[PDB]
Structure 1
Amino acid sequence: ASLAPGTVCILLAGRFRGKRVVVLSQLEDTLVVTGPYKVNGVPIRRVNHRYVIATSAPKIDVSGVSVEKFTKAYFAKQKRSGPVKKDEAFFAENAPKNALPAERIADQKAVDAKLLPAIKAIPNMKEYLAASFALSNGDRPHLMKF
């Protein structure tokens, strides 16, 4: 219930662990979630609902951005059907520089610009999103409320 769209949640696992991101829409199993890429550098990704902590931070207005174009086929990888993989040239491929179609670039830019006005309106949210969540000495997760 707490994973409403527009909520600020903390990524627990993955390469973006500890980042704070803004939930856009609820997919069938996961959350199509992204922090404003100009803020924390987290592009649009699916994140399983078991790997987020829904914080009690004030909600972000995400009604003004279309979310129906984010589907399983939208985020799906390419078919392989073959055991042969991996190469130094393969690692040189993909990457942010190659692949990453300009259509994906434009959507990320569009949704990013649409979410700036809300986070600028609410004070101390831009720095809150840019920061990274972390546990310190004497912090008990079953006590603290997010």
Structure 2
Amino acid sequence: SAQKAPKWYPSEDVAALKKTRKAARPQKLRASLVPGTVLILLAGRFRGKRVVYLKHLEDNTLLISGPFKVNGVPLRRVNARYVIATSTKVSVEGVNVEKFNVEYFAKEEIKAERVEDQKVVDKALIAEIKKTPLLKQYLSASFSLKNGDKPHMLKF
């Protein structure tokens, strides 16, 4: 016995956690995000793509659409904190965004239902975007800073 066995042994029993007092409570959004807002994406593959905001999903994320006919952005989730909200808006009424949920995006080419829902949304949104001048060119444009851009001076 090259080490003398100890008398007291610590228990191998795990213990139950205390009844924690943290209720789940929903996100109080900042007021610059209203359905219809043209947004700017700061991260992901679609960085700097000007995009069209849609229904606030219930995993505290933001379902957005491109529309994909313009810039190349699908229906997608984007978190709220990674997004610069521009001031300019579009009308969103008439678009049945309220089908989708968290279950819709499921990690496992494209499942064809996604492209079908893309066309169904984007035809109404293109019919909305044609109503305002120069906006269809604007959403296709990427966003980046120039020299002498001071993003505290800049407004959105």
**TM-score, normalised to structure 1's length?**
0.83
Aligned equivalents of 2:112, 2:87: Cα separation in 1: 35
Q: Are 1:103 and 2:134 matched, yes or no? A: no
Give the 3-state SS of the residue equivalent to 1:121 in structure 2: coil
> What is the match of residue 141 of structure 2?
131
Runs ≥4 residues deviating over 2 A: none
Unaligned runs of at least 5 residues, structure 2:
1-30
Q: 2:73 aligns with which of 16, 36, 42?
A: 42
Q: Are 1:56 and 2:87 matched, yes or no? A: yes
Q: CA deviation at 1:69?
A: 1.8
Instruction: Map Cα deviations across residues 13-45 of structure 1 (whole Å, 9 max, x no partner).
Output: 000000011011111211100111110010000
Aligned equivalents of 1:140, 1:70: Cα separation in 2: 38
Matches within 5 A, 1:1-146: 1-28=31-58, 29-57=60-88, 59-78=89-108, 98=109, 100-146=110-156
Unaligned runs of at least 5 residues, structure 1:
79-97
Q: Quick check: which one's helix share is greater?
A: 1
Maintained 8 Å contact 2:51/2:67: yes
Whose RCO is larger (CA < 8 A, sep 6+)? 1
State the Cα RMSD in Å. 0.9
Looking at CA atoms only, which structure, 1 or 2, has the larger radius of gyration? 2
Give the 3-state SS of the residue equivalent to 2:64 in structure 1: strand
Aligned equivalents of 2:135, 2:73: Cα separation in 1: 16
Aligned residues: 125
Maintained 8 Å contact 2:51/2:139: yes
